[PDB]
């Protein structure tokens, strides 16, 4: 069951049993990391990196090929973003909605969906403060939000 919907969807990605790398994949773990760096430098998220990789370069899971996963490869060298991509995207969506709702006070549905998105943010913020990957001093305020692109 979804967080802020009645939806009981089951559209999950389903990894195979065999964590063992396939045969055909000729790229060594280092050249995969080198290509991950090349994608990160272009300005892509670990989500967008992983998609571009498995599509055009036949690398199912970076964790399967290498040891580690894409953010931890970004983070080790310091190509990772300061605030997480998923909490970035909710703040990005909240600034989009709030801009729409500046000149559309009639749009009561928007206003309700804003409160649902605000709740997704506060909920993730609270999680990342327990894991100290955000400052304890940090708090998403909608007036301070437009600077956080």
């Amino acid at each position: 069951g979804r967080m802020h919907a009645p939806g009981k969807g089951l559209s999950q990605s389903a990894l195979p049993y065999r964590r063992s790398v396939p045969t055909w994949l000729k790229l060594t773990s280092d050249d995969v990391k080198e290509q991950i760096y090349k994608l990160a430098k272009k300005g892509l998220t670990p989500s967008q990196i992983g998609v571009i990789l498995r599509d055009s370069h036949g690398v199912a899971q970076v964790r399967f090929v290498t040891g580690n996963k894409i953010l931890r490869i970004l983070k080790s060298k310091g190509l990772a973003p300061d605030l997480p991509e998923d909490l970035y995207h909710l703040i990005k969506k909240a600034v989009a909605v709030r801009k729409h709702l500046e000149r559309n006070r009639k749009d009561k549905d928007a206003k309700f969906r804003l409160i649902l998105i605000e709740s997704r943010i506060h909920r993730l913020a609270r999680y990342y403060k327990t894991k100290r990957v955000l400052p304890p001093n940090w708090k998403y305020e909608s007036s301070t939000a437009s600077a956080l692109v």
Partner: protein, 83 residues
Amino acid sequence: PLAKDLLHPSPEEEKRKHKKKRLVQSPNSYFMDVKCPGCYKITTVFSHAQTVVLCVGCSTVLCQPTGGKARLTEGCSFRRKQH
């Protein structure tokens, strides 16, 4: 039926079922040796691509994204590779 071989699903029954609900979890995707006739190189494309996989050294654009499986452009062939 009361008695079902729950440990031994016949492969007609297993491939029928939802990927998550299979006795052991198993995807419905696969990697393709997609080759265009204009170019020399065999590119590895993911079946459910969801991007525009291009020919590196542009002779064409290979696949186009849809709901599920991507459309392989007319002219292109595919072998499904496995381990």
